[PDB]
């Protein structure tokens, strides 16, 4: 393949192979699930560790009091994108006394990702993101790919073997859609969904991370003993 | 701007139980010359906000252009632009105050004093002031320049505390505003008889009245005034 050298080269069929390789980098990451109802939004993440003596890699990053995300793929790219999102939310608050909408942040991430796939000297990002938030329009969940595509969904999953969780979410859509005012039930639904992507491991207090945002709930992260009641 | 050239006079405003009222005259003066008549100094931004501007007219037109640009930018990629994602008076005031303070920090100020009035989405009234130095403040009644010396004492008669706001109807507030405008026309040498008024209410919509003239005045007693001191 002579067309995969850089990001400014189309293939004869019209494919960008560096973008596809970044997507492949995503597909080898740990599974994360995002879910929402009319009042709350939830992220569930399975961590990974190098070995037993090592700690587990963090997967959930807080962007603002009403917004956060979980990552799958290359972590430093997630850090870069999260810092950019934090700066944008801070700018919105400082200049307009306004809470940045989730859709606008998705647009900003799409625009920032597009510029890295059209000019020489730069690679596309190597991470996929699930973004949850609560704003004046309610709860929102977004999925971001490094090709620049951003989609708004009721629920989704990314990473290795996420198809089972996605099928579970698609089957039980009408159930978790209407879990309003009961955050624990939504968290348990998300945990059950992420249980569908496990093959040779079980959820423990060391490898499970949860995040929640809602109508009266700021973006909060639970890990360790704080998730012991959801296992 | 280092020195204003064409300038507008005071803008006055007050809050009542349901909404806010703002008013300003239609004169652009040129160094003691009453040069331009028919200058609208109240700019409605949407349906819930009115911005009243005093000072340099060219900077006022620049600010109007900025506000229109802000509305257009807010409408982009926003299906809820006519909904819960519409612009609010708080957003507009924060943006304008940021601009004023940044331009003051560069020794290139916009020689203006601005009152933003409106009604928030939750129904709360909004009324705030920012000038060419970036100084901002809020009060149940607001006025800049000359009006701040004569309109405020009258308006504070009607609404002297925050507790007086629920007692004030729209009719009383509008009568007070009109009387203050008449007093300003009596005693301000850079003022005009023609003015515009705007009412922003939480139940009803924005009401923008133009071509309002100061009504029946007291001039008859002038016939009794003879020469100064001892004449006649």
DSSP A95-143: HHS-PPPHHHHHHHHHHHHHGGGSSTT-PPP-EEEEEEEEETTEEEEEE
B77 touches chain A (CB under 8 A): yes
- CA-nearest residue to A95 within chain B is B95
- CATH superfamily for domain B1-232: Aminohydrolase, N-terminal nucleophile (Ntn) domain (3.60.20.10)
Helices A75-96 & A102-114 angle (0-180, nearest 10): 130
* C-alpha span between B232 and B215 (Å, rounded): 33
Query: Do B155 and B12 form a contact (C-beta atoms < 8 A)?
Result: yes
Integer CA distances (angstroms), A222 to A204, A207, A213, in order: 13, 12, 12
Query: End-to-end alpha-carbon separation of chain A, Å?
Result: 47
Per the listing, tokens 């203050």 go with: B180
* Cβ-Cβ contacts under 8 Å for B119 (sequence gap 6 or more): B19, B20, B48, B89, B125, B126, B200, B201, B202
CB pairs < 8 Å spanning A and B: 26
Q: Residue B91 is nearest to which of A97, A103, A137, comparing CB atoms?
A: A97
Per the listing, tokens 């009245």 go with: B209
User: What's the half-sphere exposure (Cβ side, CA atoms, 13 Å) at B98?
Assistant: 14
* Cβ-Cβ contacts under 8 Å for B149 (sequence gap 6 or more): none
- CA-nearest residue to B76 within chain A is A104
Classify residue B74 by burial, with Cβ atoms within 10 Å: 0-12, 13-18, 19+.
middle
Query: Do A159 and A143 form a contact (C-beta atoms < 8 A)?
Result: no
**Which chain A residues touch B84 with a CB distance below 8 Å?**
136-137
Task: Determine the distance in angstroms separating the CA of A61 from the nearest CA of chain B, rounded to an integer.
Answer: 26
Which two tokens mark B193? 């008889």
The three-state secondary structure class of A14 is coil
**Which chain B residues touch A94 with a CB distance below 8 Å?**
98
* C-alpha span between B18 and B167 (Å, rounded): 10
Classify residue A65 by burial, with Cβ atoms within 10 Å: 0-12, 13-18, 19+.
middle
Domains in chain A (CATH in brackets) are 1-231 (3.60.20.10)
Q: Best mutation site among A90, A94, A97, A138 for testing chain B: the one with the most B CBs within 10 Å?
A: A97
Query: Do B117 and B89 form a contact (C-beta atoms < 8 A)?
Result: yes
Q: Residue B80 is nearest to which of A95, A98, A137, comparing CB atoms?
A: A137
List % helix, strand, coil for chain B (3-state, nearest 5).
30, 30, 40
Task: Determine the distance in angstroms separating the CA of A152 from the nearest CA of chain B, rounded to an integer.
Answer: 14
Classify residue A120 by burial, with Cβ atoms within 10 Å: 0-12, 13-18, 19+.
exposed
* C-alpha span between B100 and B103 (Å, rounded): 5
Interstrand relation of A67-73 and B112-119 (parallel, antiparallel or unpaired) = unpaired
Task: Determine the distance in angstroms separating the CA of B91 from the nearest CA of chain A, rounded to an integer.
Answer: 5
* C-alpha span between A176 and B65 (Å, rounded): 47
Which two tokens mark B188? 């301000």
* C-alpha span between B60 and B52 (Å, rounded): 9
Task: Identify the sign of the CA torsion A78, A115, A122, A25.
Answer: positive
Query: Do A23 and A145 form a contact (C-beta atoms < 8 A)?
Result: yes
Task: Identify the sign of the CA torsion B156, B160, B164, B167.
Answer: negative
Helices and strands (H and E) in chain B: how many: 4, 13
Task: Identify the sign of the CA torsion A168, A169, A174, A175.
Answer: positive
Task: Determine the distance in angstroms separating the CA of B109 from the nearest CA of chain A, rounded to an integer.
Answer: 18
* C-alpha span between B97 and B56 (Å, rounded): 17
Classify residue A151 by burial, with Cβ atoms within 10 Å: 0-12, 13-18, 19+.
exposed
Tell me B133's DSSP state.
T
Return the closest-CA partner of residue A26 out of A212, A211, A162. Answer: A162
Resolution of the deposited coordinates, in angstroms? 2.0
Backbone angles phi, psi at B113, to 5 degrees: -125, 130
* C-alpha span between B117 and A58 (Å, rounded): 47
Return the closest-CA partner of residue A72 out of A36, A101, A47. Answer: A47
Q: Residue B85 is nearest to which of A97, A107, A136, comparing CB atoms?
A: A136
10 Å Cβ neighbour count for B138? 12
Q: Do A97 and B90 touch (CB under 8 A)?
A: yes
Gap sites in chain A (C to N > 2.5 Å), preceding residue numbers: none
Q: What size, in residues, is chain B?
A: 232
Which two tokens mark A182? 């009961």
The kind and range of the H/E element at B35 are strand B33-37
**Which chain B residues touch A104 with a CB distance below 8 Å?**
77-78
- CA-nearest residue to B84 within chain A is A136
Q: Do B98 and A104 touch (CB under 8 A)?
A: no
Per the listing, tokens 């959930």 go with: A60
* C-alpha span between A124 and A54 (Å, rounded): 30
**Which chain B residues touch A103 with a CB distance below 8 Å?**
77-78
Annotated catalytic residue B136: no
Strand order in the sheet with A32-36: A155-158, A32-36, A40-46, A208-214, A220-223
Which two tokens mark A124? 């596309």
């Amino acid at each position: 393949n002579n067309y995969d050298g850089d990001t400014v080269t189309f293939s004869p069929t019209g494919r960008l192979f560096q973008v596809e390789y970044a997507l492949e980098a995503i597909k080898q990451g740990s599974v994360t699930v995002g879910l929402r109802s009319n009042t709350h939004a939830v992220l569930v993440a399975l961590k990974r560790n190098a070995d037993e003596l090592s700690s587990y890699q963090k997967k959930i990053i807080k962007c603002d009091e009403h917004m956060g995300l979980s990552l799958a793929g290359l972590a430093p790219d997630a850090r870069v994108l999260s810092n950019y999102l934090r700066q944008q939310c801070n700018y919105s608050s400082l200049v307009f006394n306004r809470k940045l909408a989730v859709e606008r942040a998705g647009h900003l991430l799409c625009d920032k990702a597009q510029k890295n796939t059209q000019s020489y000297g730069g690679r596309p990002y190597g991470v996929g993101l699930l973004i949850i938030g609560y704003d004046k329009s309610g709860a929102h969940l977004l999925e971001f790919q490094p090709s620049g595509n951003v989609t708004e969904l009721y629920g989704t999953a990314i990473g290795a073997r996420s198809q089972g969780a996605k099928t579970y979410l698609e089957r039980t859509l009408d159930t978790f859609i209407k879990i309003d005012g009961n955050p624990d039930e939504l968290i348990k639904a998300g945990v059950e969904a992420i249980s569908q992507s496990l093959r040779d491991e079980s959820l423990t207090v060391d490898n499970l991370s949860i995040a929640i945002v809602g109508k009266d709930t700021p973006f909060t992260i639970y890990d360790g003993e704080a998730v012991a009641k959801y296992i | 701007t280092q020195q204003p050239i064409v300038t507008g006079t005071s803008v006055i405003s007050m809050k009542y139980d349901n909404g806010v009222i703002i008013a300003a005259d239609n004169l652009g003066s040129y160094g003691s010359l009453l040069r331009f008549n028919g200058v609208e100094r109240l700019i409605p931004v949407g349906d819930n906000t009115v911005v009243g501007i005093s000072g340099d007219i060219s900077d006022m037109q620049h600010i109007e252009r900025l506000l229109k640009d802000l509305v257009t930018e807010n409408a982009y990629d926003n299906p809820l632009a006519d909904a819960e994602e519409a612009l609010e008076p708080s957003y507009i005031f924060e943006y304008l105050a940021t601009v004023m303070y940044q331009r003051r920090s560069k020794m290139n100020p916009l020689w203006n004093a601005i009152i933003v009035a409106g009604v928030q989405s939750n129904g709360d009234q909004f009324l705030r002031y920012v000038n060419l130095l970036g100084v901002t403040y809020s009060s149940p009644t607001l006025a800049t320049g000359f009006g701040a010396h004569m309109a405020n004492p009258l308006l504070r008669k009607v609404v002297d505390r925050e507790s007086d706001i629920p007692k004030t109807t729209v009719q009383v507030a509008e009568e007070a505003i009109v009387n203050a405008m008449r007093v300003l026309y009596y005693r301000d040498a850079r003022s005009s008889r023609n003015f515009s008024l705007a009412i922003i209410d939480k139940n009803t919509g924005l009401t923008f009245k133009k071509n309002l003239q100061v009504e029946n005045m007291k001039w008859d007693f002038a016939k009794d005034i003879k020469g100064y001191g001892t004449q006649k």
